[PDB]
Amino acid sequence: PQFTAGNSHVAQNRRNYMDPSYKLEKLRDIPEEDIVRLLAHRAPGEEYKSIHPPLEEMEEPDCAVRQIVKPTEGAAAGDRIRYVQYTDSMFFSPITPYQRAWEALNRYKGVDPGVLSGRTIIEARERDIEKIAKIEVDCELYDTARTGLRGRTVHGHAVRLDKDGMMFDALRRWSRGADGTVTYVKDMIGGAMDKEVTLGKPLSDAELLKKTTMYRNAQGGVWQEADDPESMDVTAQIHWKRSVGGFQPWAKMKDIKGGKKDVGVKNLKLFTPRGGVE
Amino acid sequence: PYNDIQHNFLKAMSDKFAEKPESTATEFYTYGGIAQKGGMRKREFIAEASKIVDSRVNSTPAYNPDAGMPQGQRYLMPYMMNHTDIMVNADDLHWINNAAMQQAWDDMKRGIVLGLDDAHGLLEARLGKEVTPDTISNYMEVLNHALPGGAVIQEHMVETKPMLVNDSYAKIFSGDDDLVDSVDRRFILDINKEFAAGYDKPGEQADQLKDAIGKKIWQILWMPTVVARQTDGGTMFRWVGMQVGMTMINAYKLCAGESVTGEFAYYAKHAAVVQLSNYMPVKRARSHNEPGGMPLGINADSTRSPALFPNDPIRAELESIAVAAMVYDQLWFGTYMSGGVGFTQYASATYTDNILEDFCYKGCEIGLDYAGGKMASIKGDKLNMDILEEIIRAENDYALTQYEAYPTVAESHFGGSVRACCAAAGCGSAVACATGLAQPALSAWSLSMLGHYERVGRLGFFGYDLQDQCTACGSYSYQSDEGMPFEMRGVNYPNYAMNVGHQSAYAGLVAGAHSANHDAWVLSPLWKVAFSDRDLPFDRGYVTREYGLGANREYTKVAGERDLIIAGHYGREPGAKL
Amino acid sequence: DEIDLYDDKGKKLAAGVPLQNISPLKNAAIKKIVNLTIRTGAVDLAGLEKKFATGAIAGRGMVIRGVNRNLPIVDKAKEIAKAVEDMLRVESGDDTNVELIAGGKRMMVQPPTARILSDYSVGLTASMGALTHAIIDVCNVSMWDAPYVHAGVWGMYPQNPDPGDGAVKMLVDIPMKNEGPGFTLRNIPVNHLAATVRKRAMQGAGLTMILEEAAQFEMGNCMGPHERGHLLDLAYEGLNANNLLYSLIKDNGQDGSLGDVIYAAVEKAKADGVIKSLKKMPSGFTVYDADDMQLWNAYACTAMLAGVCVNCASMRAGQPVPGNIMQACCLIERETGLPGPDFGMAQGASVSSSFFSHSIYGGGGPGVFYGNHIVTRHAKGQFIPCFCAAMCIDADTMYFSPARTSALYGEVLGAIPEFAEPMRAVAEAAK
Amino acid sequence: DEIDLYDDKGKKLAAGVPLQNISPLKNAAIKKIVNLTIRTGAVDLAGLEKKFATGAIAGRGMVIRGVNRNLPIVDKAKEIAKAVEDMLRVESGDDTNVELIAGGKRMMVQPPTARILSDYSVGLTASMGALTHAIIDVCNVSMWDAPYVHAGVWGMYPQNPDPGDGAVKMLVDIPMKNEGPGFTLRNIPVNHLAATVRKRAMQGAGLTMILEEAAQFEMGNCMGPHERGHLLDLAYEGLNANNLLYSLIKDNGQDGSLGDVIYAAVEKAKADGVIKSLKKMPSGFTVYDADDMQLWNAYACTAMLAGVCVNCASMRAGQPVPGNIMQACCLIERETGLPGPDFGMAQGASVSSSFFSHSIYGGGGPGVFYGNHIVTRHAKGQFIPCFCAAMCIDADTMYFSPARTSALYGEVLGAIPEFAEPMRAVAEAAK
Ligand SMILES: C[C@@H](OP(=O)(O)O)[C@H](NC(=O)CCCCCCS)C(=O)O
Ligand SMILES: C[C@@H](OP(=O)(O)O)[C@H](NC(=O)CCCCCCS)C(=O)O
Ligand SMILES: O=S(=O)(O)CCS
Ligand SMILES: [Cl-]
């Protein structure tokens, strides 16, 4: 597939994170039981609750779709539906909220992702969501400074960073060691855990610039319009085709008075410097 | 930021944060929670809670941060009112904590416009009764006794205490200069005097209004604030009906209750009345004159900025925005349609810190740039998608860069929903200034939001972009419920009917196009004139200044209080202070 | 049960008609009437063109500056009309109909019944949607300008639930403004009905009562034995069954008082054996009773429309109707010891509407009321027809008259044979 | 335009079907489905009997002491059922129908089409009027007690405009609660539809899209060339035209993700020539265009529904659908540079429904939404069928499920052949 448009490394990051054929780099290896601790829907070693009998010991509606779509393992077992939630700093988080949903719904079977500015939640059957949490906490989409596991009190994505480059957390779920190592000392909703969970050191600024999916005209990020005109070129095109269609769905752009001459524009001028500070 | 600090965000950012505006780092966890300056109200609130609990029969607890979310792990920031030097506590912008905001909406709700010409026509047709400027003058004197709750016909009537209803009175306005000259000036809302504003010469705004209004006579009647508060907006046109009814009987020596009286009722309540808004579909059932039915253009026309600052279309935008944020977001979405802590900062983001102010002035500049320095020149054959797209992409990059390059600005606008609202408003302003046309502002709105999601990787809250994804389609649609001119939209336009962080900006865009277009009003010449009335409690020409006075408890213009008729307040024990 | 149907000139139209043959559920004429009532729109093209030219494309007291456009709708009335027709049409030959009037200044639109799947207000929306695309197409409106055309045709809708500021005018209203399920056919101002039958009282009363009873059925007030009474009220009051109504007006028209009519009707009731003595009281006063109470009611309801017609036609004014109905009801009760029209419900509506036509609180002259109106809704069908008669009879003595409020309807609908002559249409159907 | 119609198992039902043949305005099956939808009521007689015996004859949390009456309505169920049927009948052999269910604990009521003159809400009122008189007559209730019967049957109406607390349950609502003219067939909860097709997803989607599109016509959204786009959406998304819908699900149902369906749809659109290169960007990315935009929209809408089915069926849960529709639209746009389903309106409604199914503010899970709902009304017919699909697929993971909220509909409406097999009904009629 094409996935998305864009000519810059940020656009390629987007395409990779969306691409199931692309294997995401692993930065850490959090043990499953520590994952369970962090989510705090259950205690490690505790058996999965059921909201209904396993599908196999049940007669389903005579539905063609149920017939041809395999349930996930969590669904087959009748697991509860629980969730994992991340907050992504505007300061070059490796992945951004919208791209999380693109990633999730391309890569995973049977998920319910929701995108907001300061939180992205994914819901799925409990055992399924535990597996997704590990994958997403382990890999390059989670930075221990610019990403946070937060099921409530998410404030901070747009707040300035602290001295060490950590994103603000009002519940203080994390603790930072002298060597930069980040440990979670509370669960993802700020509850007490029986033990601390080490996540690891933050990526460097250069690495963050390299890995991020955001365009950001500050602190050396990619300047969308100056560095990647293709990006808005194609987004604008979508915009105008929706515009024409709402008026008359059958209409072609060429039949419109003052319609676009082409994709893109000839005379876009910018009114900020690179890095924006003046 | 914008070159002029009077409109840019740099004074606000400088005075809010210890670090520089472009600083990327700060300090957390060291403010002592609410021990900090910005925790002052919360400490005040804790001290009060104790008294409340003491007053309750089973000591049911009240306000208690330890039972909810304690505040202030980060800096609790104050805010600067847009285009002022007034700083305020965040807590003091909640409508419940701000009597100026309350009065602003009560003033709108308690208003009704009613033509007089049909009543004269009826007097003539059925009775052959003479109407002169003198009889109109007598009529208005009687009406100003009757309207607040004074008796005009019956013996043994009870009446209202005038200081409880001192904000209720009625005036007339008309495009007929000779009629206005002839009537007792105590009853006149004078268009030539309130609209001496012009562009190439004095009184052009008045000219526009008098041409639109014509030789008609219109009444603006304001009901008592306490009536709005005890009841609802549905009372308003009915109340006018009743008291105009009684006045007619007296001023024209009729039977107090004949067939003509019946027709006067229909004339007053239906045939010649002009309301603030109509009712709502029943899921969100509401009476007349409530925010749900009030078009954006009426919101805009209710501010005075265009008559007070005729060459400043962005001040007009920002004043309309301040009214709209408070009315549509804090009161309507944040209370009428939800409630609780509500939506103070979703609203205040658009009227504080000169952030939206900065974006919109820059927007107008960019739009003028593309319009070859000729405001409102991009119309007809000059209007196309290419030039729009150039304008929108330019200003969108400008505004979104500000949040990124000056992180104090993002920290103030901490929720993506207000960043989106404001970047999009900036784009809309750019198009408003270039075109003098409202509808194309919607094209800027759509592209800005889509460009925002595309650039930043995020936008607003979970359901922020419902109307935004609909915007392109609804742009120029003519389908049943899907299309309509921007000016006429409001929170009953289907995809507008649920969400914060839009209607504020929209009120601005609709005002900007028209002020840029040298139009004296947006939607209604009648409401434009009515809201010019300088006897109204809340100053509709200096909105953000009023909000600032309300915040700091310096406001002196609230109406409808009951201090005059009570010996005490619930939960507060009587007795002298020690 | 059988009745003979007489015309507005006291001539028999059909003999021994079975009572069920004039039922709104059965009579093909009543059916077509209902059909025509919900399907038929009127459009002032001239006034529309002016809206677009002035930018007065919104609600009252509103004008949008800078959106003026010159759309030659009246010049291209022909093209537009045909464009709308071709859009309304479902299949060739169907009952789709579009007509131009007054040199193309006004237009009649009737979507085919086939477009009305479930919701009667398709009559409105099909015309509105057709009209707005027709203009955009024929007048070559560009994308940028299309929303203005929507405003002009649809009014403040959807921001305002009511599209009344729009360009398509029906007799009926939008569903949200009905006061209940089944009230559709009741939401039709008396003045519109009066203009529609062009101020001929009897056709106004008949048309109005045909619609009212159609509504009674749809409200669910006509189930079981209740059904009979409604058909009797329709036949007698509405259709001048056995020429009772006419003979009552005819016999007292010269110098009869309202009271004279009441008693004329009572004596006719005895003579027809509808009522008979029940008990003589000590004063000599006799209390009557009726073996067939539903038939009595139908008699009292005709006496009521008769009295109204005679007294209003005397003053040649519409305003006496509420007080007329009141005393018709009261005096007929005091004379017989029997219950009045609709068992007090009609006297009830006569009291509210008296009040709300001579006071400051609401209503207006009889012309502004209608079946659905909170003031006048209370009687089960017998009441509002009296108002249409009164406003037909009115010699423009009221400010809010059909001439003033309803000229569009009189002009466009006035030519429809079933509206102009509803009693004849119904009788020919009952054959 | 022509399409082949296929069933839920990928088997072809009809070939060379002209697009017009599946139009709500012309298809006899669709017309019948609409007719049944406004006519058919369900009554829980056992519960009603219990209402009377306990004095719980009003609204929620209300009980009137001292008016308890024991009315053997379930005992006399057969007499009641026949009294009602006879009252509802207008002529012998007409489409009047009344059936007892579950040993007479429950009853289906279908007033004949002829009782609906103008107002679709007669389906409710005729039944309510018939039922209350039936009870009063059969159980010999005295004058004094009659009003309690009214309350049992009509609920809080007329004091409350909503007779929802009453005995007769319809798929549709009263006219006042409709959000606009023509919204009648939109005011039907997803959970009621899911129950009605007995939780078979494709039948639910199909039935729901048939009702939505009929409403779209009634709203005036299908005039002129606008019609074609709606008929294409209905055929492809709703009726599995040319097996695109089933094919997308089948091909990805084992280990496919939502994105997999989307991309498979883009590739099919290309292969079929629906979309083609417009311009190649610097990165190599190709923006596509479509000579026939309406057809592309049909393909996109089908992609949308298929993506929803695949992901929700994987989870065997309904809650994912809104976020599924969002990324379906978003991703299809990013893949092609063309506009998503309903030109952005579907994505819009996916945002609001995502919000109002995961927040404190309103809505709920997908089963409490419907086409008339302020949250989900925005798309022009293509959106809500996905919801019904999702709530069919839900394995009762949600609290407010069709099993909890809608059992009565499953039981009483479930055996209606046009409801159970809507696609086959349509395909048959389109032959
Ligand atoms: C009748 C109706 O008025 P309109 O006919 O709509 O003008 C209605 N008035 C109220 O019924 C007035 C009731 C209170 C005043 C009279 C008390 S006796 C109302 O305003 O909705
Ligand atoms: C959707 C609807 O809620 P229900 O689905 O009917 O519960 C509606 N709420 C409002 O849309 C909430 C608007 C204000 C809160 C959200 C702010 S973004 C209402 O109560 O009428
Ligand atoms: O529900 S959301 O988290 O999107 C925001 C509501 S404030
Ligand atoms: Cl006067």
UniProtKB/TrEMBL annotation, chain A:
Keywords in alphabetical order: Transferase
Assigned EC number: 2.8.4.1
Recorded name of the encoding gene: mcrG
Name of the protein in its database record: Methyl-coenzyme M reductase, gamma subunit
Automatic annotation (TrEMBL), chain B:
Keyword DNA-binding found: no
Sites bearing Pros-methylhistidine, chain numbering: H270
Primary enzyme class: transferase
EC number annotated for this UniProt entry: 2.8.4.1
UniProt keyword annotations, A-Z: Calcium, Metal-binding, Transferase
Domain of life: Archaea
Name of the protein in question: Methyl coenzyme M reductase, alpha subunit
From TrEMBL, chains C, D:
EC number(s) given by UniProt: 2.8.4.1
Main EC class the enzyme belongs to: transferase
Positions that bind coenzyme B: G363, H373
UniProt keyword annotation of Transferase present: yes
Domain of life the protein comes from: Archaea
Keyword line: Transferase
Protein name: Methyl-coenzyme M reductase, beta subunit
Biological classification of the source: Archaea, environmental samples
Gene: mcrB
